[PDB]
Paper text:
Here we identify the intracellular NAT16 as the human histidine acetyltransferase (HisAT) responsible for histidine acetylation in vitro and in vivo. Acetylhistidine is synthesized from histidine and acetyl coenzyme A (Ac-CoA) by a histidine acetyltransferase (HisAT, EC:2.3.1.33). We find that HisAT adopts a double-GNAT (Gcn5-related N-Acetyltransferase) fold where the N-terminal domain binds acetyl-CoA and with distinct active site conformation allowing the binding of histidine in between the two domains. Our results indicate that HisAT catalysis occurs via a ternary complex, and the ternary complex is likely stabilized by the oxyanion hole generated by the residues Gly123 and Leu124 of the β-bulge.
Numbering used by the authors: 47 to 371
Amino acid sequence: EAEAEPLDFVVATEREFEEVLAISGGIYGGLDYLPSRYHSWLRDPDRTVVLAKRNGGVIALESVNVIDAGETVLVEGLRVAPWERGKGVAGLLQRFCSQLVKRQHPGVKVARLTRDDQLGPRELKKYRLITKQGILLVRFNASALLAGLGARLAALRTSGTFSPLPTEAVSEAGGDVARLLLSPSVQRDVLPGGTIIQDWQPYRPSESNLRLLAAKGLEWRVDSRARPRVLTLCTRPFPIPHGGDGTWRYLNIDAFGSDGAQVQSQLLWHLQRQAPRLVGLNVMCQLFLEPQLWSQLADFCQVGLGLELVKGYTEQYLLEADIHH
Ligand SMILES: NC(=[NH2+])NCCC[C@H](N)C(=O)O
């Protein structure tokens, strides 16, 4: 029962946007970023979005983007249509893209990717684990959160439960981001495996990548610019298909450091910064933090901030594998 027409690998364009959506049903439980990101991906100068087509119909997608000053290729968004899964399509698409990178980007030495699924033996054999972070996913209505937070945080103050610790501002334009991330000691003691993870995307801490990060509208927060120990990072919210009513946004916060109290205070700062912009909308807030801090922050979010836990503990894995020219 051979397929009548063969597989054709071609670079994605804006015309296939609706075809790509048709194969993306239920991806990441409705937290899929590609609906909101597909068009920007096409404008990225170091990125190649590859579609697998059978008889002219899109059935799979993979993106490869060269970062880390040309030494790394990040693999994102790998997906196959539900009705084409289990036939090795994702494997064939992976091989086409690996050859493309080796051909166009001879300087790439490693491939990198992030994932939340359990790392089976296969993974451990083909990939090195650079680092891993815990994942805390909560949901809330922005308006309801704002209307009740003052009372919530006042109770904590008087209750003696919690009082927000001081935090310090971080300005990219002012040069604070560079002075933090280019610090060898911050890279060693703060960053997970010496790596910046921003909305599932890993970057080596380098000026070249800092330029990429600066163009995304990220917001930073730190415990002390002089004595940095906890550094948090918020990605600008964007729409996700969850809910089907178009009201849901994905708020990604990456937390680097081992002081749980500072991760709490800095998470609260980001929430008070971002929720006003989300009035009238619903938010899926995913916090990535050191695994040992998870229970502390899940409680804080649940009991302290009246937030709803969407799912139990899971982990984000940063994987790396060499490129075999
Ligand atoms: N909820 C998740 N599992 N998100 C995974 C995002 C990262 C994934 N490797 C991608 O580029 O699509």
